Design a protein around this ligand. Structure first.
Ligand SMILES: Nc1nc(F)nc2nc[nH]c12
Ligand SMILES: Nc1nc(F)nc2nc[nH]c12
Ligand SMILES: Nc1nc(F)nc2nc[nH]c12
Lengths: 283, 270, 273
């Protein structure tokens, strides 16, 4: 909605004429993972406010930025600060950047996010390779593809069964081994809820019964739009808290030093994404 | 902003009265043709066509109404339905059903093309719709949202008896005596908003929820119809099997079209 | 603001109310359908129609009543707003924010629900222990949009929505009441409505672990918790939801009355600053 094809094109063209960079891979940084932009080399920064047609920031803190550069050698463009539905953005604004990435000539999207753990076996700071998703907003009509289809992007009714690239998953699992980590790289299903409130125990139990392994309030729309455009997609959730799944466990004690360990866990995810650039196929 | 109804009662009545004075036909039955089943209109006798663009207040397509007799029965047939995924609000989607009621229709037949969730189902099957699951409805996308007009129905219409019991018995028995190679399957249709297809994980929740087939239509129309007091029955043509783990059609539509014709005889009189 | 109210708006309303009433309420009660008879038990009552009150959404019935109930200063809302009537949730929950800025610290919610737990009988009272916010899952959450920290957190916890202390005291007051039916306890699921559930829909609500279903309340509770209001509430079971294909107005007036009297009794058991 709201944007014409020309808008997307005008934006891609503007970016293309104001940077010499030509990215192949786009990375969307989740909450706490913005430090990935510091890992880029020969970086060139664009504040959203400079970029024509880019949705204005409505939220506290600085407007986000698009950072171009190389990540372990690979030509990348990186979004720091994503738009969320819960902040009152429509989905067509949330996913505006993904369409622009396509027109930039990007062929791969990496998504990161911070998630609540639903699978009992997960621990705070685990990384979960996303194998699949459940789109709750989507079932009810909040789907970023709603409205007339543009065949210049893709098909009317795109398949999502193969959303998370199988080759990249095999290669993530295989690269993880060489890094010799304490814990295994987890694999499972991300469920999107609109938020912003956190789940009740009842709601946490439904989400488990539905087969979700991790929950958050982002990502899925970007992935749907990415696949519509024929982008290759892989992604990771950093598990930032275990979701409370019983009333007995409302005998709960908080330890505020869970935030130094979380900087370390974010850092591990940032460096794992970085290294995986070696394993993405070239165009 | 969601479900901001632009239609007054007067608008619905103006449309019904325009159609009533531009054709002598007086339908008892309205039939909504799903994707690939528009050829049902060729079966009508004594037909008159109205393009949607010609009829007042009717939503514009991106479409026609055909009146006629189907196997002797006074019908109105909708060829080219509106879908939520195209960006139509549900009050535009179900506008035709309001109009049909004011035309005099007492029965709605809904047909659609669906994905198979029940593993028993095969491509080309016909599923008699026993019940539904309205996922959009749970969250707010219900075509009855807004002030209720008692001229149409109650504030809180019951939906447990949505798919007429008698018609389900007569469809099961009429099929039996057609002696078909395939059994007439029966189950729950789940509506999702669309337009993207299900992931393996979403296909599995839909199965867990007890749905046998999935699609992106029909349910709003059924709800509006029951609000109005219409008898309802319907069928899904199974066009694909939904992928549920991590690993021709023209003829089958024709079989449905012909089964719908035959079943006109089983519908009670007004 | 577009699609909402600013802090200034809610404050303007609360200040207006506060300079047009003598009452300073501690407890707010939002009455469900058929349960508004409590308002006639308020002493030193003072009544405002919604159209009287700045920024208040106009019902399309509906009033606000301040007074004392069983020794406690209350504000009572008769004729709540529902999503199915076409109201956005930021209108539905507008009064809860006003109540907070009035100085209320406790919200009592009642509603009329369909029974999904097979054990529940028509006329039963269910103490709400938890909820499932179906519309919340998909976008319809009253906190959607810009957040003001004068009300609460960006990502508020709802694990503890239904106050544990009141829950125990309700159970305890019921035991001493001598009532013959047990006081039921379970999860309320909100559906947007207005159409009632199919058999298939009822069965998913059951599999999801919900004990009773209705079309209200959850939004008010979320906004209340976001505000730090203490919350407890009750569902009167008005019908058993048809759960299989097998397929009274005066008994429900008595059952409603019983709920009204239970809320009035419990005024005495709410903590007091
Ligand atoms: N990290 C998280 N934890 C809980 F409990 N609920 C959530 N909903 C979205 N994200 C969440
Ligand atoms: N035929 C279909 N297949 C899948 F997977 N999803 C759908 N959603 C609606 N129709 C559908
Ligand atoms: N009381 C009720 N009964 C049924 F059947 N469905 C409902 N949906 C909301 N309330 C309901």
């Amino acid at each position: 909605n709201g944007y014409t094809y020309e808008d997307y094109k005008n934006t891609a063209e503007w970016l293309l004429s104001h940077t010499k960079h030509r990215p192949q891979v786009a990375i969307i940084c989740g909450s706490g993972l913005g430090g990935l932009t510091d890992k880029l080399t020969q970086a060139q920064i664009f504040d959203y406010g400079e970029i024509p047609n880019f949705p204005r920031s409505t939220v506290p803190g600085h407007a986000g930025r698009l950072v171009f550069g190389f990540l372990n050698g690979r030509a990348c463009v990186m979004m720091q600060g994503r738009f969320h539905m819960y902040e009152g953005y429509p989905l067509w604004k949330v996913t505006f950047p993904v369409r622009v990435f396509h027109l930039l000539g990007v062929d791969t999207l990496v998504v990161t996010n911070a998630a609540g753990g639903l699978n009992p076996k997960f621990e705070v700071g685990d990384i979960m390779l996303i194998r699949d998703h459940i789109n709750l907003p989507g079932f009810s009509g909040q789907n970023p593809l709603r409205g007339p289809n543009d065949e210049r992007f893709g098909d009317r009714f795109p398949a999502m069964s193969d959303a998370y690239d199988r080759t990249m998953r095999q290669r993530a699992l295989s690269t993880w081994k060489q890094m010799g980590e304490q814990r295994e790289l987890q694999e499972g299903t991300y469920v999107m809820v609109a938020g912003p409130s956190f789940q009740t125990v009842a709601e946490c139990r439904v989400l488990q019964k539905l087969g979700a392994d991790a929950v958050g309030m982002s990502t899925v729309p970007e992935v749907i739009v990415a696949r519509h455009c024929g982008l290759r997609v892989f992604g990771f959730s950093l598990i930032t808290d275990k979701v409370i799944m019983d009333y007995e466990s409302l005998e709960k004690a908080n330890h505020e030093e869970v935030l130094a360990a979380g900087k370390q866990a974010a850092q591990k995810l940032e460096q794992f994404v970085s290294i995986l650039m070696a394993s993405i196929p070239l165009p």
